[PDB]
Amino acid sequence: XALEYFEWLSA
Amino acid sequence: XALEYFEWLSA
Amino acid sequence: XALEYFEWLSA
Amino acid sequence: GLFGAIAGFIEGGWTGMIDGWYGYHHQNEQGSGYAADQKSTQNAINGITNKVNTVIEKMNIQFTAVGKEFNKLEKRMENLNKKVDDGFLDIWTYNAELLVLLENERTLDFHDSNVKNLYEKVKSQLKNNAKEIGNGCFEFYHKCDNECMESVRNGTYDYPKYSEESKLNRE
Amino acid sequence: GLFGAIAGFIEGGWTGMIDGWYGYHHQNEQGSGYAADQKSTQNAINGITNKVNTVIEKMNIQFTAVGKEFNKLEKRMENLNKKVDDGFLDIWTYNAELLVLLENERTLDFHDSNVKNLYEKVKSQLKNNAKEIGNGCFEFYHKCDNECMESVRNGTYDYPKYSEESKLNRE
Amino acid sequence: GLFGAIAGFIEGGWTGMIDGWYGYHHQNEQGSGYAADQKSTQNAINGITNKVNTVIEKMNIQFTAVGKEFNKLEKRMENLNKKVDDGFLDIWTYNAELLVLLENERTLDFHDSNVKNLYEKVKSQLKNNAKEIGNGCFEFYHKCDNECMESVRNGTYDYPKYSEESKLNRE
Amino acid sequence: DTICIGYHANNSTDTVDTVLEKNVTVTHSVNLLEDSHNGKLCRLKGIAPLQLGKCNIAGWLLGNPECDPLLPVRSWSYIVETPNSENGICYPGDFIDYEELREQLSSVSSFERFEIFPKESSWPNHNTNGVTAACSHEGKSSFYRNLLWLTEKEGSYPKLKNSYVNKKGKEVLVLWGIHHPPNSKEQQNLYQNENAYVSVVTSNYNRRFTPEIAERPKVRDQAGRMNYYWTLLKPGDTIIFEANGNLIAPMYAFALSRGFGSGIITSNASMHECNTKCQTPLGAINSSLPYQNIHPVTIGECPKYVRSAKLRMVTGLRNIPS
Amino acid sequence: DTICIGYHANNSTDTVDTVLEKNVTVTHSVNLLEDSHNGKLCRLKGIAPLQLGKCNIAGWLLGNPECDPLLPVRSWSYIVETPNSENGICYPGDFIDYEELREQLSSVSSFERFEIFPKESSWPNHNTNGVTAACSHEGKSSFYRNLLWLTEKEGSYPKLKNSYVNKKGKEVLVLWGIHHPPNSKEQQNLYQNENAYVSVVTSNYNRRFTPEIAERPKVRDQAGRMNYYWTLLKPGDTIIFEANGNLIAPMYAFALSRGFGSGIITSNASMHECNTKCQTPLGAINSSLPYQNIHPVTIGECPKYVRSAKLRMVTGLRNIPS
Amino acid sequence: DTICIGYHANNSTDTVDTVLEKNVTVTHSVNLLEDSHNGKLCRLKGIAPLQLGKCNIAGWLLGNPECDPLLPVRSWSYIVETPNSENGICYPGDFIDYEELREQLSSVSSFERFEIFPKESSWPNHNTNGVTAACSHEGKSSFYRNLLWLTEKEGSYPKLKNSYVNKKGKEVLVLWGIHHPPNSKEQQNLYQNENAYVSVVTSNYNRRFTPEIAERPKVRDQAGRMNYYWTLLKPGDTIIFEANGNLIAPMYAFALSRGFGSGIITSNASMHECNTKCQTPLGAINSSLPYQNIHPVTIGECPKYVRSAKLRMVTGLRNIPS
Ligand SMILES: *[C@@H]1O[C@H](CO)[C@@H](O[C@@H]2O[C@H](CO)[C@@H](O)[C@H](O)[C@H]2NC(C)=O)[C@H](O)[C@H]1NC(C)=O
Ligand SMILES: *[C@@H]1O[C@H](CO)[C@@H](O[C@@H]2O[C@H](CO)[C@@H](O)[C@H](O)[C@H]2NC(C)=O)[C@H](O)[C@H]1NC(C)=O
Ligand SMILES: *[C@@H]1O[C@H](CO)[C@@H](O[C@@H]2O[C@H](CO)[C@@H](O)[C@H](O)[C@H]2NC(C)=O)[C@H](O)[C@H]1NC(C)=O
Ligand SMILES: *[C@@H]1O[C@H](CO)[C@@H](O[C@@H]2O[C@H](CO)[C@@H](O)[C@H](O)[C@H]2NC(C)=O)[C@H](O)[C@H]1NC(C)=O
Ligand SMILES: *[C@@H]1O[C@H](CO)[C@@H](O[C@@H]2O[C@H](CO)[C@@H](O)[C@H](O)[C@H]2NC(C)=O)[C@H](O)[C@H]1NC(C)=O
Ligand SMILES: *[C@@H]1O[C@H](CO)[C@@H](O[C@@H]2O[C@H](CO)[C@@H](O)[C@H](O)[C@H]2NC(C)=O)[C@H](O)[C@H]1NC(C)=O
Ligand SMILES: *[C@@H]1O[C@H](CO)[C@@H](O)[C@H](O)[C@H]1NC(C)=O
Ligand SMILES: *[C@@H]1O[C@H](CO)[C@@H](O)[C@H](O)[C@H]1NC(C)=O
Ligand SMILES: *[C@@H]1O[C@H](CO)[C@@H](O)[C@H](O)[C@H]1NC(C)=O
Ligand SMILES: *[C@@H]1O[C@H](CO)[C@@H](O)[C@H](O)[C@H]1NC(C)=O
Ligand SMILES: *[C@@H]1O[C@H](CO)[C@@H](O)[C@H](O)[C@H]1NC(C)=O
Ligand SMILES: *[C@@H]1O[C@H](CO)[C@@H](O)[C@H](O)[C@H]1NC(C)=O
Ligand SMILES: *[C@@H]1O[C@H](CO)[C@@H](O)[C@H](O)[C@H]1NC(C)=O
Ligand SMILES: *[C@@H]1O[C@H](CO)[C@@H](O)[C@H](O)[C@H]1NC(C)=O
Ligand SMILES: *[C@@H]1O[C@H](CO)[C@@H](O)[C@H](O)[C@H]1NC(C)=O
């Protein structure tokens, strides 16, 4: 899974 | 259980 | 076992 | 924390910073604002992602496992099956809970580590051209616009550039 | 230690201090003595108490478990029961020993952490109004009675109050 | 790292140093060279040796364990035996992998700790008689031959001996 | 001019436990423990379960009349028994190796019901009309749908010998019965031979049955008993029945196909038009989490069952809005 | 003026192991491993165990005469067998499903011994005085206390048929036996029928027994054998015995009550006036520790058994008196 | 003048995984997972295995003629069966408690084959020449090497009664058989008694066998069956055979010695002149590592089997040649 906590993070 | 190593400690 | 990575080490 | 940073000499966090885990708050003549350090944040994200992915991967898919039936003359086999099931259950609950606890502790301490590391990096960048006023904040011995702050953020501060002026204001 | 404090730059402990885990030793004109830092000590006590309580709680009560009997034509079932019992035993011994080892290491390093943290807190409190003479001791650039020492202990040192005199004796 | 040393403010390692894990690189009028710190290195060796020995010892010798056979009317017992074997296998693979992961992390962080500790020890030895030029290197405020470097290496630096000259060159 | 290093904080109220401290509020965390199910019996990988309704396995296999007849051919992903099955063995007696037969059924994915020994056509000179009130249906006395009660015809019970050759290309579950009258009177009245015997043989099966006459405590108003037997007839093999009385002959048998990841569960829930990859007696689980506390009994690809009530792993920092 | 930050030290000689270093001296530590027991058989939660003394389970249930008779009614928390039980099956033969009966007994908390078929009163026209030297007591030839050896009376053994109805409101363990003479001579001399049979039935039990005559190697000076059988008669149900020879009839039976956390252990220790919440074959454990290395066999609420010799957890610091 | 503190680096390309980061290059590391074997069947602690070759356990014990005869006395460390054993039970039938006998054999370390009932000498007035094509050898019809087919002699089958006393000082495995003809015709032609019986007794063994006559599906061109039985005759004890037909008498028996750490494995590999302390069906393991991924089935002192493909533990530092 991905930890999308911030938008600039790469995927 | 309690760790009574010192007397001022709270219980 | 022994980790002989260096020679001065003791055995 | 373990490294004394979080809930330590930096008692609180910044709800104003919502674009990163660690970061900065600059205050100068042009204004004030928050800005996250993307490097260490991305690093932490990657590490913790790999941690969670690991914990999930280490648990194999539990395939079909149903109960069996036994007649009145097979009480021993029934009890044995029960002992097996219950034992495995005990073990797996134990392992799950323990693993989660340990990993949580290690994670918290990891964040502490990262914050303190960032602070130390900045400090070693600035040296005696600024002073530590506590709460993880530095006060400059000189003027610093947005470009200077940016030079500090992305790890490219110039010490000889301000060494003289700082030396003056230091007295 | 891991943080280099205990058995590090503070080679030994104080048997004279018997009312705390971490603490202080003050030496001035009015005399000398030991006095524990109750905050970090209470914190450590709470943490470790919760740790031990956890390890105890994670072990469910082992209820009644007796051996069974088998005749001469049930050797396979007998051997299977034995394999189950022995396997579970292996696993639980393994888990117990491992857990205790890991937790002990983490505990030692935790104490190291707390000591170093206390030292850093005091150091950041004093700044350049004193000098680090090694062995985790500070030498004052000024006079300090019992009230001053007490002001340092409970985290309320006054830097501007002694900054001038210290600046003088520093030369 | 966790302590910010390895792959941190000391970005790379020295392939030139092949007689130790941690060490020094001296540069003076008589020449330059590498030399390992035998104390902390021997310590690390001992600790990690005991760690590996532990992990090996915690695994008891797996004695003879063969499969059994079952007829067409003993499918339940067969399936139970299979469930036991498979369960134990799952558990042991889980434990092995997890243990190795945790121990590897702890080991890396341990080395980080040792390096930073060495650096701090040297720094506290030198004090203001030298300056931190980054990359874990110190620049002297005075001349230092091989004997002086040796005095620093084995933990016997003399501060009052060079305090005056250093104070001069510091200006 | 000043600059500060600090860390994230937000309105998260997520709590996690550690070794040192319980109940720590944090900024980001993931839940590893699935605790939600849909309370429905669902299709597993596109395949519907086999619901037995009023019947249990025995009542189904023997062909208890009180249960609504199924299709001749069925495929399933798992078998569902209701907790309250009043319909099973309706004529008192022992189903020999019943549990083992259940275990066999746990790896069966399909059955074809077929007439192995046709009613009027396989047992000449024998009566095939026997019924009983223990196996009632719609008030009238009846009998198992898949079995046939052979009785004396015209005051005689000739030695019967019939055989079936398995040309189905699959294992064939064959069931039969042995009747045990309470007295030698009924024994003579039904089979005309006080010293009767039943013989069933295959290539690997070989059993002989002898009537055991004695008065017994009434069960379902019957002093007589009936023992039920089964065997898996391998492809190409032949089963031979040879008896001179007391045989409850096979009429229908089952062609079985084998599968994987099947099982038998006891559940209250009802079948709905839904599909899942994990089924529990309480309902279906739709999750990618490694752990679950819903039920120990699972069919399909499921998370490992644990007793825990909470397994929350922290990803963010200690949240301090101060 | 100076101030110093330091840590605790004391005379503690406690040693603990870590992953990196073995045998570290520390200021404070807790022991998690219980290794102490009192060497006594004790009451478990106020309830005394059932000690069989010279007898084992079989010798007790069959009623071996060499063992001191117990009270008609007993309650226990666990059953204790002595390692050296010379008194058990005193007449050679097989106790069928013996282990299963033990497993049943492992969840039994109480028994009432009662006379199910009174001596002179249930078997008219049969001799009930048969004894043997294999079951000796005080020198004289005797027999099991709970069984009755029915022999021929006046040169005839009439077909007996007796029954008992379970109105005890509890499960009733009923035991009986089948005698097997070494020759047809003794067969005729004892039961007068060379083709005898025993029949035992209940609602769910149904078994027929046939004498097997052959010369056998002497065991306890007996060429004859005796097979022992048992069944649990459900409340309200009826057991029927119907035999024309070779039956070792039931005289006493047991009303059983079910319980939890019981079991059977083999122990040397003696009963003392003490109470515990955890019992091992070696003695009682009084502890709140999570682990124990005393014994794998436990009754009650006990710590988990491990093979370890030391499980000490450090709470204090590394102790350095330097 | 300058001085620097730094750490080791080298050309190591060793990679290890951590919780935070996968595939970390390091300077020093140890492998804990053994993955190498020699593909050979070896001696275990100096003792060679018992290879059965073309035979399986049953074919060996019964004495199947198609298998090369072993030495009268053998000792082993483990037994090896080939996957493709076409030689086993050559006369169709059931080997009763076969698996249990295998389990017994798993703790047997030695056997002595000996003639318990000599051919012409133990069965007077009976023919001992019976053979069959189901047990062929070199084209000619034959029979089991360790059993003897007793048939009628001169139109009569006298009741035989022979016995053996175990004076070997060890357990003696005794095997025998019961023949079941397809019809009463062959029954009379072979044993002259339509109501025959076999009786086998010891001090603790007691079994009676009755012929079961019925036409059966041909297996290995035989409508008849043959059931094989075994028992462990304790030291000093006596076994008695008493039959009037249908007995496949014992001719050879086995004196068994018990051992530890033995077992039965199925393997393709061949015996070589080598020695090991750990044996798998794939080959021998020579290792001091705690883990192995070679095979779950092990004999001797072996590492714990795991499913892992890699268990590498880091000892050195993160290697950075920069
Ligand atoms: C890091 O910060 C330095 C200083 O701000 C940046 O240098 C500026 O980069 C821009 C490009 O957008 C140039 O046009 C400016 O003139 C630069 N300032 C200076 C000091 O000349 C640098 O671009 C930043 N980026 C990185 C990755 O270092
Ligand atoms: C912490 O130390 C400061 C300094 O000693 C204490 O301030 C003193 O408190 C007492 C009360 O007993 C006052 O009467 C003294 O006059 C105070 N000294 C000063 C500097 O005025 C303070 O009370 C201590 N306690 C805490 C928790 O801060
Ligand atoms: C540590 O370093 C100090 C300084 O180099 C060493 O002192 C020298 O030791 C040698 C012996 O080989 C003497 O002959 C030299 O004269 C010493 N130098 C000085 C300053 O006098 C010391 O020997 C080293 N060893 C240890 C363990 O401290
Ligand atoms: C677990 O932590 C939660 C969250 O802090 C605690 O709940 C707080 O409960 C108190 C008492 O009701 C309220 O005043 C707070 O407002 C709650 N906080 C939130 C954010 O909801 C709870 O008390 C803790 N439980 C335990 C047993 O530690
Ligand atoms: C474990 O630690 C103990 C405690 O230090 C060691 O025992 C010491 O033993 C030496 C040798 O007999 C004595 O001189 C010390 O006085 C003992 N110390 C105490 C406080 O009793 C012991 O040697 C260590 N064991 C191992 C194998 O490491
Ligand atoms: C695991 O680490 C190895 C070692 O760094 C990686 O292999 C490198 O692979 C790249 C791509 O082929 C090569 O350019 C490097 O030269 C390799 N390094 C060495 C030293 O062999 C590998 O890519 C990594 N694998 C994963 C999936 O992380
Ligand atoms: C947290 O705040 C966000 C707004 O940024 C809101 O959408 C969300 O519902 C809040 N969640 C909680 C648990 O307070
Ligand atoms: C389903 O069965 C359970 C017993 O297992 C019972 O508690 C519950 O009431 C039943 N619910 C429904 C809806 O039938
Ligand atoms: C299962 O959960 C996933 C995650 O939301 C969702 O995409 C999917 O629709 C769910 N499937 C069903 C059938 O509910
Ligand atoms: C430690 O010293 C105390 C006195 O403070 C004494 O009571 C105790 O017996 C000592 N224990 C050990 C183990 O030395
Ligand atoms: C108790 O029995 C054990 C054998 O289990 C024996 O070693 C010991 O001598 C016996 N002790 C006593 C006191 O009877
Ligand atoms: C069990 O141990 C506790 C702890 O000392 C004690 O209070 C209690 O008296 C002990 N009980 C008995 C019966 O010995
Ligand atoms: C590492 O370098 C050494 C030379 O010091 C060489 O002997 C060895 O083969 C090399 N190993 C690898 C894996 O590169
Ligand atoms: C050994 O047996 C295996 C099957 O278990 C088979 O795959 C392989 O081909 C065989 N190899 C040899 C050399 O006989
Ligand atoms: C087993 O491995 C060890 C380690 O090299 C070696 O000394 C020994 O010769 C090996 N033994 C055999 C028989 O191969």
Strands H171-180 and H225-233: antiparallel
Phi, psi of D20 (to 5 degrees): -175, 165
Query: Which atom of ligand 14 is closest in space to residue I83's alpha carbon?
Result: 5
Give the tokens for residue H321: 């008196």
Is there a single domain that holds both residue H215 and residue H69? yes
Neighbours of H251 (CB within 10 A): 23
Quick count: other Cβ atoms within 10 Å of Cβ H34? 20
Containing E58, the helix (H) or strand (E) segment is: helix E38-58
For H182-196, b where at least 16 C-beta lie within 10 A, e where not — what string? beeeebeebbbbeeb
Return the number of other C-beta atoms located less than 10 Å from residue I172's C-beta.
23
CB contacts under 8 A, F 76-95 vs G, are 76, 79
Pocket of ligand 5 contains residue H25 by CB under 6 Å: yes
Inter-chain residue contact G20 with E103, CB threshold 8 Å: no
Chain F contacts of D117, Cβ < 8 Å?
4, 8
User: Residues I110, I13: one domain?
Assistant: no
Q: Are the CB atoms for D24 and A11 separated by under 8 Å?
A: no
Neighbours of D93 (CB within 10 A): 20
Under DSSP, the state recorded for G71 is P
Paired residues of G275 in beta bridges: G43
| Residue G268 beta carbon below 6 angstroms from any ligand 8 atom | yes
- Boundary (domain end) residue, out of G272, G289, G308: G272
CA-closest residue to ligand 8 atom 8: G268
Q: Assess whether the C-beta atom of I321 lies below 6 angstroms from ligand 13.
A: no
H296 and H236 in a common domain: no
Taking contacts as CB-CB distances below 8 angstroms, the residues of chain B near H316 are 5
Length, in residues, of chain F: 171
Residue H65's DSSP bridge partners are none
User: Which class would CATH give E1-171?
Assistant: alpha beta
Do residues G14 and G318 make contact, with C-beta atoms less than 8 angstroms apart? no
Q: Kindly list the distances between the CA atom of residue I297 and the CA atoms of F85, I119, I268, in Å, as whole numbers in the listed order.
A: 11, 42, 14
Helix (H) / strand (E) containing I121: helix I119-122
Q: Are G223 and G215 in contact (CB under 8 A)?
A: yes
- G36 and G52 fall within a common domain: no
Which tokens go with F111?
């080395």
N- to C-terminal Cα distance for chain H? 23
| HSE-CB for H97 with a 13 A CA cutoff | 16
Query: Which residues have a Cβ under 8 Å from the Cβ of D115 and sit 6 or more positions away?
Result: D3, D5, D6, D10, D22, G5, G7
Closest ligand to C-alpha of residue I43 is 15
CA distances in angstroms from G307 to D79, D91, E95, H291, I34, listed in the order given: 20, 10, 18, 21, 35
Whether G182 contacts G211, CB under 8 Å: no
Quote the CA–CA distance of G47 and D142 in Å, as a whole number: 75
Site to probe by mutation for ligand 3, drawn from F37, F42, F149, F154 as the one with most ligand atoms within 8 Å of Cβ, is F154
Please name the residues between 51 and 80 in chain E that touch chain D, using a CB distance below 8 Å: 54, 58-60, 65, 68, 70, 77, 80
Q: Tell how far CA I140 is from the center of its chain.
A: 27
List, as one string, the DSSP characters of B1-11: ----SSSSS--
Residue I134 near residue I224, CB atoms below 8 Å: no
* Neighboring chains of H (3 or more beta-carbon pairs < 8 A): B, D, E, F, G, I
Please indicate, yes or no, whether residues H121 and H260 belong to a single structural domain of this protein: yes
3-class SS of residue E76: helix
Distance to chain D for E18, nearest Cα, Å: 25
Q: Which two tokens stand for residue H310?
A: 């030391």
- Least Cα distance to F88 among E94, E78, E75 occurs for E94
Burial of F19 (0-12, 13-18, 19+ CB in 10 A): middle
- Residues 6 or more apart whose Cβ sits within 8 Å of residue G82: G52, G53, G54, G266, G267, G268
Distance, CA of G315 to CA of G31 (rounded, Å)? 10
Residues 6 or more apart in contact with residue H150 via CB below 8 angstroms: H123, H126, H127, H128, H130, H160, H247, H248, H249
How far is Cα I81 from Cα I87, in angstroms, rounded to an integer?
Answer: 11
- For G241, list phi and psi in degrees, rounded to 5: -100, 130
Dist. CA I116–CA I200, nearest whole Å: 15
Please report which ligand is nearest the Cα atom of H276. Answer: 12
Sign of CA dihedral I81, I86, I91, I97: positive
CA distance G27 to G15: 9
> Are the CB atoms for H80 and H51 separated by under 8 Å?
yes
Residue pair I286/I34 in contact by the 8 Å Cβ criterion: no
Q: What is the dihedral sign for C-alpha H184, H185, H187, H191?
A: positive
Ligand 4 centroid vs D122 CA: distance in angstroms? Answer: 36
Distance of alpha carbon F34 from alpha carbon F18, whole angstroms: 9
The DSSP code sequence of H1-62 is -EEEEEEB--S--EEE--SS-SSEEES-EEE-EE----S-EEEETTB--EE-TTB-HHHHHH
**From the CB of H12, is ligand 5 less than 6 Å away?**
no
CA atoms of F108 and F28, how far apart (whole Å): 32
- Distance in angstroms (rounded) separating the CA atoms of residues H89 and H86: 9
I11 and I105 part of one domain: no
For residues I184 and I193, give the distance between their C-alpha atoms in angstroms, rounded to a whole number. 9
**Distance set, CA H19 to CA F57, H13, H32, H105 (Å):** 12, 20, 18, 47
E10: Cβ–Cβ under 8 A, 6 or more apart, which residues?
Answer: E115, E135, E136, H5, H6, H7
Residue F21 and residue C6: Cα distance in Å, rounded? 9
Tokens encoding E152: 């340092």
CB E161 within 8 A of CB E168: no
* Residues H289 and H319 grouped into a single domain: yes
Whether G19 contacts E106, CB under 8 Å: yes
Tell if the CB–CB gap between D124 and F87 is shorter than 8 Å: no
Say how many Å lie between the CA of residue F8 and the centre of ligand 6.
22
3-state SS, residue F162? helix
DSSP code for H96 = T
Neighbours of chain F (3+ CB pairs under 8 A): C, D, E, G, H, I
Q: What is the DSSP code string of I10-75?
A: -S--EEE--SS-SSEEES-EEE-EE----S-EEEETTB--EE-TTB-HHHHHHT-TTSPPPPSEEE
CB I224 within 8 A of CB I182: yes
How far apart are the C-alpha atoms of D33 and D19, rounded to whole Å?
Answer: 12
Helix H or strand E segment including I241:
strand I238-243
Residues in E closer than 8 angstroms to B9, CB to CB, are 42, 45
Ligand 10 atom with the smallest distance to the CA of H14 is: 13
Q: Are residues G28 and G65 part of one domain? A: no
- DSSP character at residue F127: G
Atom 10, ligand 11: residue with shortest CA distance: H268
How many folded domains does chain I comprise? 2
- The finding on whether H192 has its CB within 6 A of some atom of ligand 5 is no
Q: Does F73 contact chain G (CB < 8 Å)?
A: yes
Residue of G nearest to I212 (CA): G208
Chains that touch B (3 or more CB pairs under 8 A): E, H
DSSP state letter for F169? H
D11 within 8 A of G322, measured Cβ to Cβ: yes
Q: Which of G108, H215, E78, G42 is nearest to I161 (CA)?
A: H215
Q: For chains B and I, tell me whether 3 or more CB atom pairs sit within 8 A of each other.
A: no
Residue I74 near residue I304, CB atoms below 8 Å? no
How many Cβ pairs closer than 8 A exist between chain G and I?
28
In units of Å, what resolution does this entry have?
2.7
What is D18-87 written as a DSSP string? Answer: -S-SEEEEEEETTEEEEEE-HHHHHHHHHHHHHHHHHHHHHS--B--B------TT-HHHHHHHHHHHHH
User: Which residue reads 């000599």 in tokens?
Assistant: I118
The rounded distance, in Å, linking the Cα atoms of H158 and H125 is 7
Tell me whether residues I19 and D54 touch, CB distance under 8 A. Answer: yes
Same domain membership, residue I70 and residue I23: no
Does residue H13 line the site of ligand 5, with CB under 6 A?
yes
Residue corresponding to tokens 């079994």? I207
Question: Which of D15, D35, D14, D44 minimizes the C-alpha distance to D112?
Answer: D44
DSSP string, H110-167: EEEEEESS-HHHHSTTSB----EEEEEETTEEE--TTEEE-B-BTTB---EEEEEE--
> Tokens representing E129?
């109004």
8 Å CB contact of F120 and E4: yes
> Which residue type, as a one-letter code, is found at position I144?
Y
In order, the DSSP letters of D73-101 are T-HHHHHHHHHHHHHHHHHHHHHHHHHHH
Residue with tokens 């304790």: I234
In terms of residue numbers, what domain contains I15? 1-41+273-322
Rounded Cα distance between E147 and G78, Å, is: 79
CA of G11 to the centre of ligand 7 (A): 6
Two structure tokens written together for F26: 């001296």
CA of G279 to the centre of ligand 3 (A): 76
CA–CA dist H266, H287 (Å, integer): 22
Q: Which residues line ligand 6 (CB under 6 A)?
A: I 13, 15, 23, 25
For residues H122 and H266, membership in a common domain is answered with: yes
Give the C-alpha separation, G39 to E32, whole Å: 73
CA pair distance D17, C8, nearest whole angstrom = 53
Given CB atoms, is D72 within the 8 Å cutoff of chain H? yes
For G24-42, the DSSP string reads: EEES-EEE-EE----S-EE
Q: Which of D48, D64, D75, D126 to mutate to test the interface with G (most CBs of G within 10 A)?
A: D64
CA-E150 nearest atom, ligand 2: 5
Calpha distance H302→H294 (Å, rounded): 11
Backbone φ and ψ of I140, nearest 5°:
-75, 145
CB H312, CB H30: distance < 8 Å = yes
Looking at the fold, whether I47 and I185 belong to one and the same domain comes out as: yes
Helix (H) / strand (E) containing G271: strand G271-276
Closest CA to H107 of H261, H244, H271: H261
CATH number of the domain where residue G310 is located: 2.10.77.10
Q: Determine if ligand 3 sits within 6 Å of the CB of residue F151.
A: yes
Residue pair I30/F164 in contact by the 8 Å Cβ criterion: no
Domain boundary among I256, I272, I288: I272
**Nearest-CA residue for atom 19 of ligand 2:** E147
Type of residue at D159? Y
CB H70 within 8 A of CB H80: no
| Backbone φ, ψ for residue D52 (5° rounding) | -60, -45
Q: What share of chain H is helix, strand, coil (3-state, %, to 5)?
A: 10, 40, 50
Distance CA G6, CA I188 (A): 103
Question: Are H225 and I238 an interchain contact pair (Cβ–Cβ within 8 Å)?
Answer: no
Cβ contacts of I316 on chain C, cutoff 8 Å: 5
DSSP I197: -
Q: Residues F116, F122, F123, CA angle at the centre, nearest 5°?
A: 85
Beta-bridge partners for I250: I147
CB contact under 8 A, H21 and F48: no
List b or e across G117-143, with b for residues whose CB sees 16 or more CB atoms inside 10 angstroms. beeeebbeebebebebebbbeeeeebb
Structure tokens at I180: 């079941």
Do I49 and I187 share a structural domain? yes
Amino acid occupying residue H255: A
Asked whether the beta carbons of I250 and I175 are under 8 A apart, the reply is: yes
Spatial contact of G114 and G72, defined as CB atoms under 8 Å apart: yes
Please count the residue pairs, one from chain D and one from chain H, whose beta carbons lie less than 8 angstroms apart. Answer: 12
Q: Is the CB of F146 under 6 A from ligand 3?
A: no
Question: Which of H10, H11, H13, H15 gets mutated to test ligand 5 (max ligand atoms within 8 A of its CB)?
Answer: H15
Q: What does each C-alpha distance from E143 to E14, E27, E161, H5, H6 come to in angstroms? A: 25, 11, 12, 19, 22
Chain E residues with CB-CB distance to G20 below 8 A: 47-48, 50-51, 110
Is residue F92 within 8 A of residue I303, CB to CB? The reply is no
Please list every residue in chain A whose beta carbon sits closer than 8 Å to the beta carbon of residue D56: 1
Solved with: X-ray
Q: How far is E17 from chain B (nearest CA, A)?
A: 11
Ramachandran angles phi, psi of E32, nearest 5°? -135, 155
Residue F106 in contact with partner chain E when CB distance is under 8 A: yes
Check which CATH number belongs to the domain holding I96 and give it.
Answer: 3.90.209.20
